[PDB]
DNA sequence: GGCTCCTCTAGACTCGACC
DNA sequence: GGTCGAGTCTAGAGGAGCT
């Protein structure tokens, strides 16, 4: 199974009881190993480039994991309590019954709480990032961060864009993001029909949409777009309205808030399921691009070639797996099966012939063909292949 | 306890027995200076079971030692002198050693040798030619023949000149030995290398001044170049080298295409070396008749330096520290240039006290709304292409601009020169050509000398403008206020800077010279005194320059040293079993390309190893000697001769005045705590100056015949220095004799001017220390005996100590901390502090014998 | 003008004037980085990642939660996670009492999870995980950039870039000195004044050797990175003494690797490089500056110029160069003001496209370092920008 | 009292580039 | 076939290194 397969190749992490459908979706454990982080690091970059770099009037936001906290009910965010203060009450003076009741109330009245979504992080930065565009609309605020949802406490890395758009054409902009997000998720997908959009409505009646992924157990909302309007923005900014109004083309209009929210921890599971003895991750998402090894002796001579070759690829931004450093040996086929399930794009072998004319063996993950290529032409081919796949 | 009439302590009875009216005059001179009386406490008596001295007296003993040590090699040299062989033979392009008749390795015991090396490969030998009786020999490297894509960048005995009681001769045999495969092994294969250059320097050596004039005595001497030596000793047709210089300036392909010519240009040199040696050998055996001289020279020709994997680490760390410390200095200068380009705007450069006199001219670049809503899906592709095509259309205007790209017209002229061209392969952003030595850097840094801005005159060098594009005299006055009335170096009014008096900066060599760069370390004391106060770094620039000055000059030598790493199979069993051994490391050696002679004083010279490059706390790469670390199982026993030349001069003075130790005031002060000059002048001004111990004659370039009362200083210096070289010869001969007779596993490591180091196993180390002490004692006894003195003082009988240390360093207690080695040798490498043992401790540990 | 005020105006900092104090910036109890400061840190975190995880061998990423399991140790001061519903359920659904409520408070300190204080304990939980990855081949390491919570009470958050190095005890004194040298070079690589980064040896409460990097902030030196020779006790604490799972291959034999912790402060790192780099210009390193190109338009025709700039914008963005689209600004800005605006924002180059560009294709190209305007053809603009940035690395 | 090597700078010749 | 603004090479001078 993929859950076990990603465990062997260090895409997954945790005990056998933690590699379960309910536990993986929970986020109560570190579900990614050394390789899974880098693949999830690629989704963070691909999301960032296509939603911030190439997009007009989108800016970066970083927000605290904790929130100020409130005494209102119906919220289940886990609070943060100082153990020293807890030990202070129990050990110092033996407070009365009334004090203990007050202490537990104080743990909800003033104690901070962990964040559940990144929307409130952007809203406190709306005023300062409004100044960034000289109060022009539309614009957005994007962020990737870990959010906590109760279950214990689960950790979910959400990629959220808060798009501020005028009240007019808010539905059109929501369809604009709905199409781009559906195209962005389907851009890397080997099965783009697994990503779906469905119309959904908020409890307050506000319009919205969801993006699912057809996991083998069912479709899970990897991404959800809500047309929040201005109620959420006015909640964080009550009273004066001048500081909230953006300068539209004809009048000052409070921008309706579009909440484009997506989960990269859950997204990475989608692209792990989508790729699956070879994980055919998209060339922009595979965490390991090049696998370098030494074919035979002389080990000292070949390892210098690989180390020189490795230093060239690393300086070019291409991630490499220095497999030549291992003292153990296995058959070439065992290396091929090992690398495929590791989603290694290309496997490079430095043999004696590399010392004679510079020709090396270049195996492609997608086609299983070995191409004989000169050492100097290796880096040119790798950059060309990655550049074409990005576009 | 034995005392001379002058109360000087001498050898004890036990040592004296085994080894071996003018008093009133001596006291009168002694009391006149004020050294009469004042006795000293007697040192503890030393007794040893010295081996029976051969031939009776010490002189005959050392003569017998030399005649038993160098006997086979004299015959080996004589074999060439009467050898017969066919003339210079076609060149062979094959691999390995080829025998040019009328074998895997040359078999004969005599070989005139020369090696040619392509500098493109750096250090690996390219080809070599060997002269041997009855057959020539030629060598071709496997890198020259096969032409593979890449080779091993680390050297080893595998890719070296192979071989296998034998004498090898050449013009710079060092080079020949440094490329021989078997000379890097810790096991000492019995081969000795004899140099024609060293024998030339011994016979007709030209001094430092004489070679300058040579490049009378001119007809009897010549320079060390092979052509000059061949013209001197043999003459005939002159030698010619190929003007192409393929080995030095040409690539490997050119050497491949001209192999049949390089194999002739090398064979010619080998034959010339043989012809020179034919006349050098009898002439040198005549000039220096004492066999100890030749034996000591052959022992100086086998210097061997072991290293380990730390050598590559040393090179990498030193180079990276040099770069980073240079990058910090370079990047600090570049920012000063960038911050000055802003003075162009508003014509403010004319008010800068330092950058007014620069090129600020500029060239010219001459040739030949409401929200629309979300863009629709079709607008996405439409907008993309129309913007993309609006650029690809402009790509056709490439031919509307000049072919040669005009270089930074916007940047001022002085900044353009500091910025490399865009097409330069070494182009770096900003003023990448800045350096402290440039004439703009003292102007960029806004340097001040005692409150005055600096300025450069094309004749007088760097100076400062004392107030009194037009120079901003107002700015000069303004700076002085912020910081006739000056009387430094003479004000040169020929410069004629308006409103200023140009006073030159002081120089170390006097006012007759000019200052070329105010960043010279000579001005470092002036920097701290507050006179030469820099502006926008500062002293840190001078500190960086001081720290990297050694490595800047010496990195192309140290990094280029030919290190051959021994494989595990070639290491001795001792190293493969010592607890300090590690399989993940590699161990090797450096063969110092030491010329046995090289001066008129017959001193051995080498730019890297035979220079006193002791570790410094403020120098990058100065731990060079500390990187000579014995492999596990071995140690470096050594000693420093206490006042070698000083005691030689004293004993020469003592042997002349009253014929006893301490009779001279100089000798009295030397032994404890102008007669020497008279004897030195008598020896130098004689018909043929000779060493007062081994009778080695002076070079034919300094005999009074050719030079009629000329170069007196060189001769008088030569007397003492050649006596020191004789002392070294005696020490090396006696050490080799004691090593071979008593079967001590060791070999000669290296001998700097005044040190003697030996690579010996820790097992037999105290035995080696006792051997060294005995050799010292015997050498001192012979030196006293040959001068007409029948006794030797106790105070100089034995060394102060004999060092036993894991690495090469001046003292065993030094950790060798440098900017590139801040943790020292104890922390970074685990080398413990060595042992220093006096004579008594060595006696106790060795029980008085071996 | 002060640096904090400058960075607040140019969106390197974010926060109220009360949150921009010296102590408040050190604590981390508030998101202190604006849209540009996040990009400066995102560059700094990428520079650390390339130097320590990409270029270095035997270094891997690690995923560690923000929550550590509850420890009953009284010396612990980490904040605990408490369910708000659990507090309400006990307190409101029944009558409380002095006897019964203490059972709930005692259970909090005993079982409830806690916010992590360092990335070390996350690496130790993944130590065994990497032993399979590297086939036990000592030495190796795990590196991570994440948020660590430390009490101030208030919960301060600072982004720590940790490297937990597992080496045998013989080379522990060597790798501790190796990383201390390797770290001090990386911090000094981007600094305008490398002398401000210093190292001083320190000893902890157990006498173990250590080394702490500093940056000479204007108020005083701050320990942005501390290195420790922790030893075996941290591994002996997390793992119940079963030596089989702790020993790795240190050559021929097997030895329990000595733990070395290098713990840089990324959030304090950007603060140093903002102080290090500071006419008013943030002379940030080209590999650290958030904005590198600043496009623009001329007098007119603006419609034709914007077609060129939009095509130019996609040319640079597809080539990995951050661009500031200054041609979309709705208020006309003079050159003198536009230049100082780009300088304070640490913009490397101020590209300007005018009507002349439509015929010959030459665009002006100003430099932050030199403030000198040089013209260049559009076709060669990308080549120079890539070359300048590649040579700055 | 001597050199020698590295680095920076000025001047004269060459070139090909444009016209 | 003409001027002329970059390459290029040689020559000169000064600092650091050894006696």
Numbering used by the authors:
A (entry chain C): 42 to 192, 204 to 328, 344 to 458
B (entry chain A): 52 to 71, 81 to 149, 151 to 163, 170 to 231, 246 to 296, 328 to 480, 508 to 607, 626 to 640, ...
C (entry chain B): 41 to 192, 203 to 328, 343 to 457
From the paper:
DNA polymerase γ (POLγ), the sole polymerase for mitochondrial DNA (mtDNA) replication, functions as a heterotrimer with one catalytic POLγA subunit and two POLγB accessory subunits. The POLG gene encodes the 140 kDa POLγA subunit, which possesses polymerase, exonuclease, and lyase activities, while POLG2 encodes the 55 kDa POLγB subunit, which enhances DNA binding and processivity. With over 300 known variants, POLG mutations are the leading cause of mitochondrial disease linked to a single nuclear gene4. Cryogenic electron microscopy highlighted structural differences between human and mouse POLγ, particularly in the POLγB subunit, which may explain the higher activity of mouse POLγ and the reduced severity of mutations in mice.
To better understand the differences between mouse and human POLγ, we employed single-particle cryogenic electron microscopy to determine the structure of the mPolγWT-DNA complex. Following the approach used in previous structural studies of hPOLγWT-DNA complexes, we introduced a single mismatch in the DNA substrate to induce POLγ to shift from replication to proofreading mode, capturing three conformations: the replication (R) conformer, the error-editing (E) conformer, and an intermediate (I) conformer. As expected, mPolγWT-DNA complex adopted all three different conformations, with reconstructions refined to resolutions of 2.7–3.0 Å. The I conformer was also similar; however, the catalytic site and Y933 residue could not be modeled in the mouse structure due to high flexibility in the fingers subdomain. Additionally, we observed a slight difference in the position of the distal POLγB subunit. However, in the E conformer—and to some extent in the I conformer—the accessory POLγB subunit occupies distinct positions relative to POLγA, highlighting a key structural difference between the human and mouse complexes.
